[PDB]
Write an enzyme that holds these catalytic residues in place. Sequence first.
Site, PDB file in Angstrom:
ATOM      1  N   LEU A  13       0.813  -1.211   0.000  1.00 26.72           N
ATOM      2  CA  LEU A  13       0.000   0.000   0.000  1.00 26.72           C
ATOM      3  C   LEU A  13       0.854   1.274   0.000  1.00 26.72           C
ATOM      4  O   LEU A  13       0.392   2.327  -0.436  1.00 26.72           O
ATOM      5  CB  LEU A  13      -0.959  -0.013   1.197  1.00 26.72           C
ATOM      6  CG  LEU A  13      -1.909  -1.218   1.247  1.00 26.72           C
ATOM      7  CD1 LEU A  13      -2.786  -1.154   2.492  1.00 26.72           C
ATOM      8  CD2 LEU A  13      -2.760  -1.300  -0.024  1.00 26.72           C
ATOM      9  N   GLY A  14       2.093   1.174   0.477  1.00 24.97           N
ATOM     10  CA  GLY A  14       3.003   2.320   0.504  1.00 24.97           C
ATOM     11  C   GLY A  14       4.213   2.089   1.385  1.00 24.97           C
ATOM     12  O   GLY A  14       4.287   1.086   2.093  1.00 24.97           O
ATOM     13  N   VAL A  15       3.965  -0.774   4.442  1.00 19.67           N
ATOM     14  CA  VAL A  15       2.533  -0.989   4.667  1.00 19.67           C
ATOM     15  C   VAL A  15       1.951  -1.960   3.628  1.00 19.67           C
ATOM     16  O   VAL A  15       2.015  -1.698   2.427  1.00 19.67           O
ATOM     17  CB  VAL A  15       1.723   0.343   4.648  1.00 19.67           C
ATOM     18  CG1 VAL A  15       0.233   0.077   4.883  1.00 19.67           C
ATOM     19  CG2 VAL A  15       2.248   1.318   5.700  1.00 19.67           C
ATOM     20  N   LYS A  30       1.427  -2.331   9.029  1.00 15.75           N
ATOM     21  CA  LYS A  30       2.609  -1.502   8.866  1.00 15.75           C
ATOM     22  C   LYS A  30       3.786  -2.279   9.419  1.00 15.75           C
ATOM     23  O   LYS A  30       3.794  -2.651  10.595  1.00 15.75           O
ATOM     24  CB  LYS A  30       2.444  -0.163   9.590  1.00 15.75           C
ATOM     25  CG  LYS A  30       3.607   0.807   9.396  1.00 15.75           C
ATOM     26  CD  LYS A  30       3.127   2.243   9.608  1.00 15.75           C
ATOM     27  CE  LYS A  30       4.246   3.255   9.556  1.00 15.75           C
ATOM     28  NZ  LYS A  30       3.729   4.609   9.875  1.00 15.75           N
ATOM     29  N   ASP A 115       1.931  16.425  10.476  1.00 14.47           N
ATOM     30  CA  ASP A 115       2.239  16.173   9.064  1.00 14.47           C
ATOM     31  C   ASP A 115       1.003  15.926   8.223  1.00 14.47           C
ATOM     32  O   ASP A 115       0.952  14.994   7.415  1.00 14.47           O
ATOM     33  CB  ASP A 115       3.241  15.016   8.931  1.00 14.47           C
ATOM     34  CG  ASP A 115       3.949  15.001   7.588  1.00 14.47           C
ATOM     35  OD1 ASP A 115       4.022  16.067   6.922  1.00 14.47           O
ATOM     36  OD2 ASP A 115       4.475  13.925   7.243  1.00 14.47           O
TER      37      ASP A 115
HETATM   38  N1  LIG Z   1       1.180   4.918   8.206  1.00 15.98           N
HETATM   39  C1  LIG Z   1       0.224   4.428   7.745  1.00 15.98           C
HETATM   40  C2  LIG Z   1      -0.883   3.874   7.364  1.00 15.98           C
HETATM   41  C3  LIG Z   1      -1.254   3.755   6.008  1.00 15.98           C
HETATM   42  C4  LIG Z   1      -2.486   3.154   5.718  1.00 15.98           C
HETATM   43  C5  LIG Z   1      -3.298   2.696   6.752  1.00 15.98           C
HETATM   44  C6  LIG Z   1      -2.887   2.852   8.065  1.00 15.98           C
HETATM   45  N2  LIG Z   1      -1.714   3.440   8.338  1.00 15.98           N
HETATM   46  N3  LIG Z   1      -4.419   2.172   6.186  1.00 15.98           N
HETATM   47  C7  LIG Z   1      -4.319   2.292   4.833  1.00 15.98           C
HETATM   48  N4  LIG Z   1      -5.210   1.902   3.908  1.00 15.98           N
HETATM   49  C8  LIG Z   1      -4.931   2.105   2.613  1.00 15.98           C
HETATM   50  C9  LIG Z   1      -3.735   2.695   2.187  1.00 15.98           C
HETATM   51  C10 LIG Z   1      -3.584   2.896   0.709  1.00 15.98           C
HETATM   52  C11 LIG Z   1      -4.251   2.061  -0.208  1.00 15.98           C
HETATM   53  C12 LIG Z   1      -4.139   2.272  -1.580  1.00 15.98           C
HETATM   54  C13 LIG Z   1      -3.379   3.330  -2.066  1.00 15.98           C
HETATM   55  C14 LIG Z   1      -2.730   4.181  -1.172  1.00 15.98           C
HETATM   56  C15 LIG Z   1      -2.847   3.975   0.205  1.00 15.98           C
HETATM   57  O1  LIG Z   1      -2.183   4.831   1.032  1.00 15.98           O
HETATM   58  C16 LIG Z   1      -2.798   3.118   3.166  1.00 15.98           C
HETATM   59  C17 LIG Z   1      -3.124   2.892   4.513  1.00 15.98           C
END
Ligand SMILES: N#Cc1cc2c(cn1)[nH]c1ncc(-c3ccccc3O)cc12
EC number: 2.7.11.1
Length: 258
Positions: A13-14, A15, A30, A115
């Site tokens: 997702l980036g 995680v 994460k 942030d």
């Molecule tokens: N740090 C962090 C973080 C980052 C996330 C999260 C919880 N914490 N839930 C998410 N769900 C989707 C995504 C995501 C999905 C698709 C495209 C981009 C995204 O950031 C990122 C997080």
Amino acid sequence: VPFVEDWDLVQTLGVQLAVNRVTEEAVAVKIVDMKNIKKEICINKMLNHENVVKFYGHRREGNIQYLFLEYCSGGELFDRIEPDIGMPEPDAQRFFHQLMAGVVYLHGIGITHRDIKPENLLLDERDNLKISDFGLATVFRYNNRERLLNKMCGTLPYVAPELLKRREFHAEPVDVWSCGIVLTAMLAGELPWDQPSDSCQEYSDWKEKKTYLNPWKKIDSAPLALLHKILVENPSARITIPDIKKDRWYNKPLKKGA
Ligand SMILES: N#Cc1cc2c(cn1)[nH]c1ncc(-c3ccccc3O)cc12
């Protein structure tokens, strides 16, 4: 029920996106190889709000920490902002409402995010906004006593001018400022300046009220009037969230239900 604690990691997702082997529940995991995070976990344990990414728990295995967090299938607000255009005003107002709700909540429990930017504002399957990533977050009020901040952190285009100019500063106006830059981006599809310094020409132009220039010329007078109250250089003179909630644009009917 056997196997209910097993998760398949299926996508970065980036995680990682994790899917439960039994229930098929999707969470975000994460993964942080510790070879900083204790504070993030500590703050995450405090949080319970519909506009803040939920924390489910954590497990450590040797050096790798695993935080189990709310999965937001709509991705980042960043990707709803069309370059040079932004998004429809009613969508921006709705997202701004939800952002304020989340920030009011955090500030009420004495937490500052530090942030706020569209990369950290996630959307669920119903496009509800969720504040994410508490890796830079800190306590600014404890036992009803405020602590002034001094660490420079955040992301330059989103940071308030006092963070560049003063040794110490109040936490809440800094988060208000970043929310204003987010609003500008939603309504114009561009960031107004590289950073809010007197050396930055675009920032000087704003202080001189040259709103016939971009991004400001793309923004309607009503939301622009709000931005004039948020993007105020003196953090003591800057609009507070209770007063943002009284703002004419903030309260303007714009958007139909789903
Ligand atoms: N740090 C962090 C973080 C980052 C996330 C999260 C919880 N914490 N839930 C998410 N769900 C989707 C995504 C995501 C999905 C698709 C495209 C981009 C995204 O950031 C990122 C997080």
